[PDB]
Amino acid sequence: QLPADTKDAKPLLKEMKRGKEFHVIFDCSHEMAAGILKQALAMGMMTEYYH
Amino acid sequence: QLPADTKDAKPLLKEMKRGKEFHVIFDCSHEMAAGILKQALAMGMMTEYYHYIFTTLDLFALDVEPYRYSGVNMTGFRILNTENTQVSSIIEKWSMERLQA
């Protein structure tokens, strides 16, 4: 579950990166999905490995 | 060699990514270093797999806010003795006096 306090999912994305969860399904809105993508690019989670 | 007459080195970054060249030494000015960092981030080859050594001495002037969390290891050098108090005072004085560009 994405954090509820604010649209800063950096701890969640870090935990996903540590757990080697490359294939991810996002149940959000496009406004929130854009922010999640921006924060995933900041952790290099947008590469050929991740889907 | 980075392409001439342009700063968009997307073909070069794609060639390096396809060639699986993870450790790179960049010989360019800090402006072109920032440009190539942005191109590589847009190319998706800026992760913990990649290590970049920058031979430029202005790596401290780089804006690494989008890049710190990626897990990369950007290594470089800095001859500017910023750790000194007098050097920091001179740098701040120059920055305040500049007010230009």
From Swiss-Prot, chain A:
Modification note: Sumoylation mediates kainate receptor-mediated endocytosis and regulates synaptic transmission. Sumoylation is enhanced by PIAS3 and desumoylated by SENP1.
Where does this polypeptide localize? Answer: Cell membrane; Postsynaptic cell membrane
Tissue expression from the record: Highest expression is found in the olfactory lobe, piriform cortex, dentate gyrus, hippocampus, granular cell layer of the cerebellum, and in caudate-putamen.
Its biological function?
Ionotropic glutamate receptor that functions as a cation-permeable ligand-gated ion channel, gated by L-glutamate and the glutamatergic agonist kainic acid. L-glutamate acts as an excitatory neurotransmitter at many synapses in the central nervous system. Binding of the excitatory neurotransmitter L-glutamate induces a conformation change, leading to the opening of the cation channel, and thereby converts the chemical signal to an electrical impulse. The receptor then desensitizes rapidly and enters a transient inactive state, characterized by the presence of bound agonist. Independent of its ionotropic glutamate receptor activity, acts as a thermoreceptor conferring sensitivity to cold temperatures. Functions in dorsal root ganglion neurons.
Family the UniProt entry places it in: Belongs to the glutamate-gated ion channel (TC 1.A.10.1) family. GRIK2 subfamily.
Further information: The postsynaptic actions of Glu are mediated by a variety of receptors that are named according to their selective agonists. This receptor binds domoate > kainate > quisqualate > glutamate. It does not bind AMPA without coexpression with GRIK5.
- Subunit record text: Homotetramer and heterotetramer with GRIK5. Tetramers may be formed by the dimerization of dimers. Assembles into a kainate-gated homomeric channel that does not bind AMPA. Can form functional heteromeric receptors with GRIK4 and GRIK5. Can form functional heteromeric receptors with GRIK3. Interacts with DLG4. Interacts with NETO2. Interacts (via C-terminus) with KLHL17 (via kelch repeats); the interaction targets GRIK2 for degradation via ubiquitin-proteasome pathway.
Listed name of the protein: Glutamate receptor ionotropic, kainate 2
* Native source organism of the sequence: Rattus norvegicus
Q: What is the lineage of its organism?
A: Eukaryota, Metazoa, Chordata, Craniata, Vertebrata
Entire protein: which part is shown? 203 to 253 of 908
